[PDB]
Design an enzyme around this catalytic site. Sequence first.
Site, short mmCIF file in Angstrom:
data_model
loop_
_atom_site.label_atom_id
_atom_site.label_comp_id
_atom_site.label_asym_id
_atom_site.label_seq_id
_atom_site.Cartn_x
_atom_site.Cartn_y
_atom_site.Cartn_z
N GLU A 106 -3.68 0.22 8.18
CA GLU A 106 -2.64 0.73 9.00
C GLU A 106 -2.82 0.11 10.27
O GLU A 106 -4.00 -0.01 10.82
CB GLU A 106 -2.44 2.20 9.18
CG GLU A 106 -1.61 2.78 8.06
CD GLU A 106 -1.80 4.19 8.07
OE1 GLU A 106 -1.61 4.78 9.15
OE2 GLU A 106 -1.97 4.87 6.74
N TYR A 111 -4.91 2.20 15.69
CA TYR A 111 -3.63 2.28 16.81
C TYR A 111 -3.82 2.13 18.24
O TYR A 111 -2.80 1.54 18.94
CB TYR A 111 -2.74 3.54 16.37
CG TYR A 111 -2.32 3.51 14.83
CD1 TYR A 111 -2.64 4.07 13.98
CD2 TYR A 111 -0.89 3.19 14.85
CE1 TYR A 111 -2.30 4.32 12.79
CE2 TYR A 111 -0.09 3.21 13.57
CZ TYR A 111 -0.83 3.84 12.51
OH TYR A 111 -0.22 3.83 11.09
N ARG A 133 0.96 -1.24 0.20
CA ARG A 133 -0.06 0.15 0.12
C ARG A 133 1.04 1.13 0.01
O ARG A 133 1.61 1.17 0.89
CB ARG A 133 -1.05 0.02 1.25
CG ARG A 133 -2.00 1.17 0.95
CD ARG A 133 -2.96 1.28 2.26
NE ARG A 133 -3.58 2.82 2.10
CZ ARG A 133 -3.55 3.48 3.61
NH1 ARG A 133 -3.04 3.29 4.54
NH2 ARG A 133 -4.03 4.61 3.29
N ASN A 173 -7.71 2.01 9.70
CA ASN A 173 -6.74 2.44 10.32
C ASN A 173 -7.14 2.16 12.00
O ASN A 173 -7.91 3.06 12.46
CB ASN A 173 -5.98 3.66 10.10
CG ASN A 173 -5.56 3.53 8.63
OD1 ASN A 173 -5.56 2.86 7.81
ND2 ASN A 173 -4.78 4.91 8.16
N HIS A 188 -2.75 11.55 0.09
CA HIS A 188 -2.30 11.24 1.52
C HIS A 188 -1.48 12.39 2.08
O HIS A 188 -0.44 12.49 2.32
CB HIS A 188 -1.06 9.91 1.48
CG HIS A 188 -1.00 9.33 2.63
ND1 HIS A 188 -0.80 9.81 4.02
CD2 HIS A 188 -0.94 7.85 3.28
CE1 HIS A 188 -0.45 9.08 4.79
NE2 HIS A 188 -0.82 7.84 4.43
N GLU A 239 -7.28 9.20 5.64
CA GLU A 239 -7.39 9.87 7.01
C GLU A 239 -7.88 11.17 6.98
O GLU A 239 -7.34 12.07 7.55
CB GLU A 239 -6.26 9.66 7.94
CG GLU A 239 -5.80 8.31 8.31
CD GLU A 239 -4.68 8.12 9.39
OE1 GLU A 239 -4.44 9.20 10.01
OE2 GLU A 239 -4.31 7.22 10.11
#
Lengths: 490, 490
Positions: free
Chosen positions: A397, A326, A91, A324, A137, A183
């Site tokens: 991610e 985290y 990616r 994504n 991005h 994002e």
Amino acid sequence: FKPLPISFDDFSDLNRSCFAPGFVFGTASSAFQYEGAAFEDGKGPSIWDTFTHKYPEKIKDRTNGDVAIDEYHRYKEDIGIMKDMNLDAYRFSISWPRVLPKGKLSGGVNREGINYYNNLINEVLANGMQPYVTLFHWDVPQALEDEYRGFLGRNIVDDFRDYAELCFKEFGDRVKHWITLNEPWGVSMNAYAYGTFAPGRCSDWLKLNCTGGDSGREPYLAAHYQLLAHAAAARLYKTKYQASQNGIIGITLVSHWFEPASKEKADVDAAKRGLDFMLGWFMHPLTKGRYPESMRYLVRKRLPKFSTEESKELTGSFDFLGLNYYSSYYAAKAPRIPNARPAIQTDSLINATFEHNGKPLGPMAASSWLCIYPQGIRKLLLYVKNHYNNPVIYITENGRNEFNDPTLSLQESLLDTPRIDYYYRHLYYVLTAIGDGVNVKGYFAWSLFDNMEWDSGYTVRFGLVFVDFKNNLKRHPKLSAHWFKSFLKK
Amino acid sequence: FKPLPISFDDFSDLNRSCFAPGFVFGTASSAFQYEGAAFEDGKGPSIWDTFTHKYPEKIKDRTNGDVAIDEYHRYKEDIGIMKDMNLDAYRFSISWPRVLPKGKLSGGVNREGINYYNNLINEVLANGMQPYVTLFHWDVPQALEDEYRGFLGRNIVDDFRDYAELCFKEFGDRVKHWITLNEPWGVSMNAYAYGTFAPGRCSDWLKLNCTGGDSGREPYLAAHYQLLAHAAAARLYKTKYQASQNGIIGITLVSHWFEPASKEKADVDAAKRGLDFMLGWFMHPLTKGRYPESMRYLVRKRLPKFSTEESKELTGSFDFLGLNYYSSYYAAKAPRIPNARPAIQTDSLINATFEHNGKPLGPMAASSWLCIYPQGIRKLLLYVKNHYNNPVIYITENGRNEFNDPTLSLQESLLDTPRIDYYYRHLYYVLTAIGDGVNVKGYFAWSLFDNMEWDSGYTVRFGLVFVDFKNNLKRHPKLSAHWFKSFLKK
């Protein structure tokens, strides 16, 4: 919850054979963080190029992305590592200003820019991997920022549709997995609510040294135009290119898990609002053509409105969701302060912390917002399945970091056992979500190599592979790279 | 620092073949934390027995050690696990009040008490392991506490010499490795300076809900008599039993690594004082027969004095050092507050933290004093070698914990990857200390099984093996037990 019939009798029991044979394992990156060659072969400047050189004091170590890890010239070696590691995919993102130096289609197409992505795409496929490509991005061409304030101007939608069409016509024959945005929450909040990302705007009264702005209005504007840009690119692909190219298109959203502070209804309701203001902001419009009720009720007038036509174009415009994950937070109700000036961060009426009566939710990584709570990925995954009618999901991610420490020897720097801990438990919880019916089809680690972490500069390291920034950017695989290679070996 | 010629190309590259063939690998425990049978087969009460039932509110979960993990009745199964794991030794303690119910030798010897330790010792040796035995592991007979305030009375020395002699005569034929005391710093500070351990004393003005005391005087008294008790037991062994029994005797001390807050001389000097007040307190007297100069200069009159004879008996009374390491702290100079009441915690004039300008030294485990900094063990080891003329060292305790969480399933509870991370990096740094000349001869993990953590009760888990406290204390090896078994397999 109901366990998995495995039996983790050895450490080597958690491997790729635990997942369906078709599950995709890859790694992710972005153009600004990896490429280098910022002024080379006809590329035009992005807002991140401008931000770092104009305001070096806005970067923790006062660094920039001129050279980064030089993937522009080192892409063959980078793909070589991926092939040795048994990965299925990569990616990466395309730099808007590298292919269209002035942003607009009437500013000219950089042919040399087009050639780089053709070389990269052919290398990925020649090494038995599939490319997963992100159109935007965070690297807005400086020309469009100068002209109409980039994603704060409605003019961005038409220019973004033209950029997407160029990529679809040039690379569409080989690329079958497209991702429109990366994002939009991050851009909205960090670039327009806190001022840490380019162009660094926020309300003056917050005393965060911003370059102008309004945190109660601009974040909502930036998110609204980001959604319109996505819809334009996604509808173009489906109506004109999908029948001949035979690929799929989606979008990448970031979200944290919000855990109620207590069992109280007020704390239960605060966690729900956390999810509504972070994930719901983008998923409501994408599935229903309108913002969540809680955002509508608490933001009222400051929340933009979709036209009838804009709602129709947005509803259902994605083949898959790029998720994504985290970190996780504890959420508690925050009381309304009388006479408070409006700001997106206080609008939701939530107090988000990493502890409950001094007791931690989990330990912290090197980034101050990243709290390790592996259960969060499973709970986030079930929330998406149950609230958003079970879409197809790709985890785009997932990862953790350590501090760059110059006193450590190379051998010491390569013993990244905490990262192994992080991937092992997160991968276990992904497997339990799949067991409970979530349609997860792939997983991408952030990231293969150490790189520039936006405003934190090179003070933190997120890779599986160590990059020696003092000796010709040398690649030195950490213990976690060897562990991931063994995980993927059958 | 200079690396190790290994090449950590696989995760399985760090194993027992990296250490000398004679290096000892074992696990540690204590009588109060593991045995159970608190009132059975003629045992008398300890101060920990009394403390928990009298003051249940002084224990986090209001629990006790009546049953613990019942090793008293389950020792054959426990040794069985150790044998399956390929361990070399077991470090355990003898309960003073189990063998001598009234403390004194004239109160009577419990024959049944003697029989239990004979059975345990013979089981350890029959399963190809060597016993490492601790005489005092904080369980002062209640009779001696009632009579003369236990380790606050000079009367303790003669009674402790009698207890040691009983163990040497009864068990000395099989036991060749004896440890007189377990962490005298812990007793001194937690029982007499903070009031968290039995008997729970501290200065009234601290507002820690203590049972009487003085934190500026009692901690120093308790440490002084502990050292005299050690000398008495160690001199007895060497002069009367060592020539026929052919074993060795030492003492176990606990110490943290103290890292200077900055490069400034004041911060450099503060770290040194941290080591002097924690480790130096006991090692100075053991090697030189006097307290460190800094303690003498800052404590003056409140610091007891050794007689000429006491100094002679103490100097050199150990065959090896038992070192306990867990955590590290940043040390900075603390300014003298005018008119401050005296207390041992403020006497050293140090500000100890886990961060430097908000940046963490490492992440935290479940205990609030345990900060993970693997480099600390190597630096502590080199400090002992360079300051205390290179003694023979055995690492007698090393480990981390997690919270007891009732919402987790068994499978989830067994995935203890953070503990694997902790042992991997600490074991790597031990190897680098050995490479630089430290005489490390063994390493003992704290602990094999989950148990009662003193005043924290059963709210935290330190084991390699999970204990199900709701279903007949069932033993369920965690992932870390399987990992340690593979580490020890050749």
